C-alpha cells in the first residue's frame, strides 16, 4: 500500500540539571528503526530494526554527526523561544518536531510534513505546498519571517521530494519481509454479565500490523458510536498491536449486536458475534 517515513525530535530543557535532553526517533510506518538520545553514555544514532543494520559506518557516522548538530540547534531554539514568550529561565520547556514524507504504492510522493510544537502546542508548520508556513502565534511569526527571508521552505521541499522519498524507498526494499507485510488481527468476542439485566460484549483484535484498524459495534445493523468504549490501540512489544471495543447490552439481546473489523491485512471486513 502506501507508506510513510517520519522522524520525531523532542528537546526538553531542565534548568539547574544540565543542558536540554535531545531524543530523536525514526519510523517507517509503525516500525521504529533508529534512535538517538543525548543522555546516553555514548550518544549515537543507533539501529532499532534489523533491516537498517546493514547500513555502513558512513551512514551511522553521518547520522550521529547530524543528530549532535541538531541537538545543539534545538538547545539554541529553546533559549530563543524563552525570549519570544517572555518566559523566565527557571522553568522547563519542550520543543517537538515531526517531519517526513508519505509515498503511494508506486513510490511517488503523496505529501511531505514539517511541523514544530512548543510546550505541546502548535508553533509553526510547513504547509502542504512545501513552500509557505502557518505560524500559530506572534512568536512563531518571528520565526516565520526569518525562515521566509532565508528560503528555508525551499530547502525542506528539496529534502522531502528528494532524499526523503529515496531513502524511504530503499528502507522499504531492505525491509520488504516486514515493512511490506500486513498481519491481520486475530479476533474474538467475550461476554461478561455485569448484573442480571446487562452484559458487556467486548470485541478484541490482537496480533495485527500496521496499527491502523477500525472496530465498530452495530446493534440491529446500526453503529453504536456514542455507546461504544474503545481503548487506544496499544503495542504488544513484538511489532504488533492490540485493541478492543466494548458495548453494554441488555441481557437476552446479545445476538442483536455485531462487531465489525476493518484492517489492511483482511481481504474483506469481518463481522463477528458472541458465540456462547
Amino acid at each position: 500500500g502506501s507508506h510513510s517515513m517520519r522522524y520525531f525530535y523532542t528537546a526538553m530543557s531542565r534548568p539547574g540539571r544540565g543542558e536540554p535532553r535531545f531524543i530523536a526517533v525514526g519510523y517507517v510506518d509503525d516500525t521504529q528503526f533508529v534512535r538517538f538520545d543525548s543522555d546516553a553514555a555514548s550518544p549515537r544514532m543507533a539501529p532499532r530494526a534489523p533491516w537498517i543494520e546493514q547500513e555502513g559506518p558512513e551512514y551511522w557516522d553521518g547520522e550521529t554527526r547530524n543528530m549532535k548538530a541538531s541537538a545543539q540547534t534545538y538547545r539554541e531554539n529553546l533559549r530563543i523561544a524563552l525570549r519570544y514568550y517572555n518566559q523566565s529561565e527557571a522553568g522547563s520547556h519542550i520543543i517537538q518536531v515531526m517531519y517526513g514524507c508519505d509515498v503511494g504504492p508506486d513510490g511517488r510522493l503523496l505529501r511531505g510534513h514539517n511541523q514544530y510544537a512548543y510546550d505541546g502546542k502548535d508553533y509553526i508548520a510547513l504547509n502542504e505546498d512545501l513552500s509557505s508556513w502557518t505560524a500559530a502565534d506572534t512568536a512563531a511569526q518571528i520565526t516565520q519571517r526569518k525562515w521566509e527571508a532565508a528560503r528555508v521552505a525551499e530547502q525542506l521541499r528539496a529534502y522531502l521530494e528528494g532524499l526523503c522519498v529515496e531513502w524511504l524507498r530503499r528502507y522499504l526494499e531492505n525491509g520488504k519481509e516486514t515493512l511490506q507485510r500486513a498481519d491481520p488481527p486475530k479476533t474474538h468476542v467475550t461476554h461478561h454479565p455485569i448484573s442480571d439485566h446487562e452484559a458487556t460484549l467486548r470485541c478484541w483484535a490482537l496480533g495485527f500490523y500496521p496499527a491502523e484498524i477500525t472496530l465498530t459495534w452495530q446493534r440491529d445493523g446500526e453503529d453504536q458510536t456514542q455507546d461504544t468504549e474503545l481503548v487506544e490501540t496499544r503495542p504488544a512489544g513484538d511489532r504488533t498491536f492490540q485493541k478492543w471495543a466494548a458495548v453494554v447490552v441488555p441481557s437476552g439481546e446479545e445476538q442483536r449486536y455485531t462487531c465489525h473489523v476493518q484492517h489492511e491485512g483482511l481481504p474483506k471486513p469481518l463481522t463477528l458475534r458472541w458465540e456462547p
Partner: peptide, 9 residues
C-alpha cells in the same frame, strides 16, 4: 535518513 537543515528560530 534525517534532514541536515536544522534551522534557528
Amino acid at each position: 535518513l534525517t534532514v541536515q537543515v536544522a534551522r534557528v528560530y
